[PDB]
Design a protein around this ligand. Structure first.
Ligand SMILES: [Cl-]
Ligand SMILES: [Cl-]
Length: 162
């Protein structure tokens, strides 16, 4: 199992523009298009992303291509993030995946704000972090997804994903 799979599980795959759990226009494998309330805006941002006149629908390959870009960008962002980098580097491979998941869902900034948890993760205080991580909006909004990631950080395994 790996990040792509892991994120393909949490995010799903949709070939037609849709609203995310927050109501934002999204497409593909959790590819946010816009925070705008306008579907035209989203159709536009879509076409710009694809390089074609899509009409709110893309192929799977297209989806996968956006997905690749997004994973790459997320990593790269993390690595350029002073609060993030260090934690990331301290982690083992599985847990790194858990962090990237979060980052993809929530944005580096979003994630860089879980200071306490971040710190606990860095100290490898798994149970503590898992509890800390759970005191969050994120957990309360998307409990299941959140629990998956939390287990992964706590256990260092893919269990939650099997
Ligand atoms: Cl893009
Ligand atoms: Cl959920």
């Amino acid at each position: 199992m790996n990040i792509f799979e892991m994120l393909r599980i949490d995010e799903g795959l949709r070939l037609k523009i849709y609203k995310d759990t927050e109501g934002y226009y999204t497409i593909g494998i959790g590819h946010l298009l816009t925070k705008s309330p306008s579907l035209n805006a989203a159709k536009s941002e879509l076409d710009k992303a694809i390089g074609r006149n899509t009409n709110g629908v893309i192929t799977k390959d297209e989806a996968e291509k956006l997905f690749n870009q997004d994973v790459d960008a997320a990593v790269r962002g993390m690595l350029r993030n002073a609060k993030l980098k260090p934690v990331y580097d301290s982690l083992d491979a599985v847990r790194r995946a858990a962090l990237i998941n979060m980052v993809f869902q929530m944005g580096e900034t979003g994630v860089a704000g879980f200071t306490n948890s971040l710190r606990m993760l860095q100290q490898k205080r798994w149970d503590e972090a898992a509890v800390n991580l759970a005191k969050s909006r994120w957990y309360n909004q998307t409990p299941n997804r959140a629990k998956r990631v939390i287990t992964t950080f706590r256990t260092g395994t893919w269990d939650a994903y099997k």
